[PDB]
């Protein structure tokens, strides 16, 4: 999970991602089965 991998595997900025509570944020990526 690089910054590049993050952005392409979602279509959003890591800054927008970071703004969410950390639990939710990581659950977005985990429920999607990415990382």
Q: What is the CATH number of the domain that holds 20?
A: 1.10.950.10
15, two tokens? 């800054």
Question: Whole-angstrom distance between the N-terminal and C-terminal Cα of the chain?
Answer: 7
CA–CA separation, 33 and 19 (whole Å): 21
What is the C-alpha separation between 10 and 16, in angstroms, rounded? 11
- The secondary structure of the chain in percent helix, strand, coil, rounded to multiples of 5, reads 65, 0, 35
Question: Domain limits at 24?
Answer: 1-35
Give the contacts of 18 (CB within 8 A, at least 6 positions apart): 25
Six token digits for residue 30: 């985990």
Cα(17)–Cα(3) distance, rounded to whole angstroms?
11
Contacts of 17 by beta carbon, 8 Å cutoff, 6+ apart: 6, 10, 25, 28
DSSP character for 9? Answer: T
* Total count of domains within the chain: 1
């Amino acid at each position: 999970l690089s910054i590049e991998d993050f952005t392409q595997a979602f279509g959003m900025t890591p800054a927008a991602f970071s703004a969410l509570p950390r639990w939710k944020q990581q659950n977005l990526k985990k429920e999607k089965g990415l990382f």
